Design a protein around this ligand. Structure first.
Ligand SMILES: [Cl-]
Ligand SMILES: [Cl-]
Ligand SMILES: [Cl-]
Lengths: 472, 470, 470
């Protein structure tokens, strides 16, 4: 590895942020754009952000000043002939990039690495007509580049393995964490994250719960840093929907990547979230706190509580059953007893559903029991698989499918989800913890209930459930 | 409070709408770009109102006063007097956006702006215009004077008072309105898809001649017209374009899948009645549906006994009401001759014999049916047959509409009763036919075909579980 | 009686079709608008037929006699004498519709008007054409003089008299006609899809190297060429395009899904033999697959006993022919080591070890097979494996085309034998392999993958129930 001079193409948020990372680590950076005004603004931004870090003592004055000196604005594409690495982050349109990379093939030596920050375009299609296709690769950073640790190092069909190793070593040296993946739709992060959003839209379309309740279960129950619906409001409905539709279409309309009419409606209505003041939520009025059910009195206490195995607690005559994807109602008529279905992980927020056939006294016994264990009990509709378990199962299923299709290694899939979108466990590590047979049973029940190919357990999930029963 | 009504576009539906508005007291400001097409359309209304005066439904005094309320215009700035605008122009996304942005400042701030669209989102149109809450869908059915239903379609911003206003207006026009949100196919065009689509599938697999399919749905199930003759009257191009529109708008959801058999009729210009040819030859006389000849009194059964689960045994044979399994599947399993029956209230009955039946065994089943005064049409051994399969799918679709918050249960039933003249509303019809019965049929079809198309929706499962507890 | 023949088009298929008609005693009006291309087409026919007079495959008297019958023309009005027109021009639907309209005025009402199109509907072409009942498809395969199959394609208007004429005519050209309706992929391009698609799926999951996949199908199943090397020879772009075309025309039916793997090669310009690299490196010679090495006689079986057919007990181990369940699934359900085998008639066999197997147990099974004289290829524990999975899907696809009335059983079988040179016609093959076996395998794959793609079609369930009698 001998990457010295780095060229960054584009003066937007990503280009400027990528330039900052490269220059802050000792590289001469050629920041290229055709507009000299644009370059000046982008460079003023970097100046301003780094100077405020020195103010707060988060960066030395020396490293600040040495960083700024390495940022060289250029308007002539020929100046990039000196670069060992070009990182492109300008127009997302395919034909523009193809034209850009064709131009860089003649300008630069054939040993210069030519990379793109794109999230949406095939590397293979970028690298298709250009001179030495083997040194074309994806180097995919996340907003904001100076803060986010993850980069996806993306191989196109032609991408050499030495090029991947060089790019991994270099981003390691920039204090990043590279993960490798092939040029398949959504890479790792945009692909595996999809059911986090789409399970919520489905819940929302069926009025299972208020959006605040869905977000509270996922954040304060499952441990995600932000609920999926609020996160779509903060990403911007237009942006998140465009990613969904893109992955959906690039997989020739796979129903596990189906878009939502609820989301579509918000986009075409211009209700894009925080940025426009209204989305799923109103961003003018400040955020309310989800309460949970008031304490049931000590007089409503159960006479006999018996924790059985397989997520069953028997409370007098009430079965409190952790969701396997069957409704409280189906269980209650099968077993001729009242049933409360619970959806819980480690967090304090817990969702529950009572079978319609429950007398309210039986439901209250179960609510009391839970409250006396520290949990905030939120009541929702009797929805198969509920919220937390339904969403995490589908996230894990998608991670497993990506692993099976050779998108990336198991460890790189876990890392990507931990760093790119801050999931509290990588999905594969999460599945091992939660139990493969348990995830399998749930998805099979969902698949049966809905009769949708969307809820199919993937072949590697069945494979891992079978291995797990082998150790049992 | 609406006085003057603007009706934009001079099409078939635009003319029928203007007639409804006029004959209920409203002064109608009819718009088009072509001034020659204006007088063309009004004289169409003149021609149609000269035959309803001859019957005695309207006197010639009120007839003339109706015709004098229709005022043709060609300038769009002059419509500032209209309290209500009803768009029925071209079905293009930019045709509507430009018109409504213009009508933001031409029309008053509180003037209700509606559209008769079958296929464009209301939210899409109301996006970049000034006052969003007064924009809606007012969806009439062909022909607008005769069909009693309008769908009042909310966009995302449409206010509930506006919804109420347009409901109050259509009520006053002899119509019965229904509320739905802006989702593909609204209520009527969505819930009715299986009526046609199942018939197309039957045809493709040559289950029966088209007349047999139409007779089964008409004089068996109780529909005013069979789905195939209906598509010939609607026009193949029109019905096929709605099927595709709904299919594409749900991102290719396979229970809305189009049919190659219909596509061939369209691309070959066989558009139905209007072109003289579609499914049927409309340039010739129609031979009525036969029904098998009666069998002799010597072929009479000895023993007849009704059993539980829609089975009646007749000698060594079994006449089984269809649960979605084939007669052949039932005959090899139960090791006895089986004939499967597809029937509701009407005289017309379809049947299938298991290929393993001796002809004598089948004739006994035909005889018993004939001795109940029923026309017996024999078709292929087809999972779910014709009537039960179709109605089960219509009901499934109705339940998914309800589940997804498109409209209320009573409104959905009203929509199918008045938008397409179904004998009962599907949700009421499901309760009468039995939810467990509907569920078990669709599961058997889901098993037989392995298609997501035939998936019981979640709400059906829920209601079947509730029914099992009564 | 057909005498004069008009061919329109001067490319590969245009030349070929002209060559066929000329050599069988027909005056051939070769049409193009260009005169430079017309000469270059005749030069190619002259080059090919003269390289066969020198190679002792044709006589000079017959060669010169054939090459005289080739009359190049640029005026479309010159085609008025033609008893039959065969079109093979540009595949845009507009240009074809415009040319065929022109032709009807120039030629008599009884002149047969045909096209060599693989992907455009005959009913669309015949829509606004005088006397449309004499319009059909005449679909030849590259290379036209070599390939024995012709698909004779009915539009909705195509007459039964015209079909007979074209069948009798093509028969007289030393060809074999098959009759089918105008539906996507006709017979051959539709039924052949899973041959390619299963291979791509195996590659995406890294089940085995591409050579191994190709050797299983060629030397184990008896296909003349394995699917992957065949796509390299067809051209990755051409094969992908047909896959996509069929997929889209069936409104995105999952049975016809394209592959990201093949897409990546097309997009990356690795189009196969024609550009030096596709799936395989054609710039270097390729070794045959070895197969596993001889296991020593120390792992000799204590006792060999054929258990219930499909299942063979070897002491510790069970050798189980694939029925769609993984070696691992069986291993833990039978509480015994399992080796799954995927075999038909050729020497080449694929096997998969269950992960729970001790390596000595697996070797016992390997030894046992090697001593039967078979090449053993070890691959991943893949549901349905390669041969049986592929053939079952080809059989399922042929059954679907049969029940949708695309073509008769014998014609489907004939079309696969002569169009793509398959060792057996799929429908005959399926009876020989047994319907219930094919049924059970597809059901096991459908359950495993939860995909509509692996659904048994309706006709397959019917034939499996029929097979359980006798
Ligand atoms: Cl996103
Ligand atoms: Cl319609
Ligand atoms: Cl091909």
């Amino acid at each position: 590895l001998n990457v010295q001079t780095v060229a960054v193409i584009g003066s937007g948020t990503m280009g400027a942020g990528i330039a900052e990372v490269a220059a802050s680590h000792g590289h001469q950076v050629l920041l290229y754009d055709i507009s000299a005004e644009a370059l000046t603004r982008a460079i003023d931004g970097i100046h301003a952000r780094l100077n405020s870090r020195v103010t707060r003592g988060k960066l030395t004055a020396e490293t600040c000043e040495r960083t700024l000196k390495r940022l060289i604005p250029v308007t002539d594409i020929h100046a990039l002939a000196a670069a060992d690495l070009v990182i492109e982050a300008a127009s997302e349109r395919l034909e523009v990039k193809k034209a850009l990379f064709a131009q860089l093939a003649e300008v630069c030596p054939p040993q210069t690495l030519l990379t793109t920050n794109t999230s949406s375009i095939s590397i293979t299609a970028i690298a298709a007509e250009i001179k030495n296709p083997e040194r074309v690769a994806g180097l995919h950073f996340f907003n904001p580049a100076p803060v986010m640790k993850l980069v996806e190092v993306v191989s196109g069909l032609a991408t050499a393995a030495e090029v991947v190793e060089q790019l991994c070593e270099l981003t390691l040296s920039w204090g990043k964490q590279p993960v490798r993946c092939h040029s398949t739709p959504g890479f790792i992060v945009n692909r595996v994250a999809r059911p986090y959003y789409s399970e919520a839209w489905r819940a929302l379309e069926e009025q299972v719960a208020a959006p605040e309740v869905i977000d509270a279960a996922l954040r304060d129950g499952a441990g995600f840093p932000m609920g999926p619906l609020e996160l779509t409001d903060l990403i911007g409905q237009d942006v998140n929907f465009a990613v969904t539709c893109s992955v959906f279409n690039a997989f020739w309309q796979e129903r596990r990547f189906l878009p939502s009419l609820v989301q579509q409606e918000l986009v075409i209505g211009g209700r894009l979230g925080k940025k426009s003041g209204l989305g799923v939520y109103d961003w003018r009025a400040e955020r309310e706190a989800v309460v949970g059910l008031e304490a049931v009195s000590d007089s409503f206490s159960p006479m006999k509580v018996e924790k059985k195995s397989d997520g069953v607690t028997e409370i007098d005559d009430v079965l409190l059953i952790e969701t396997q994807g069957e409704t409280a109602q189906a269980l209650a008529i099968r077993l001729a007893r009242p049933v409360v279905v619970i959806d819980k992980m480690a967090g304090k927020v817990v969702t529950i559903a009572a079978a319609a056939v429950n007398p309210d006294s039986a439901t209250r016994k179960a609510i009391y029991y839970l409250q006396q264990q520290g949990k905030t009990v939120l009541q929702i509709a009797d929805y198969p698989g509920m919220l937390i378990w339904r969403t995490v199962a589908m996230i894990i299923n998608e991670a497993l499918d990506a692993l099976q299709k050779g998108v990336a290694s198991e460890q790189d899939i876990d890392t990507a989800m931990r760093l790119g979108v801050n999931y509290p466990y990588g999905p594969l590590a999460w599945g091992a913890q939660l139990g493969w047979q348990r995830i399998l049973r749930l998805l099979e029940n969902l698949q049966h209930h809905y009769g949708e190919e969307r809820y199919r357990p993937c072949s590697l999930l069945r494979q891992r459930a079978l291995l797990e029963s082998g150790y049992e």
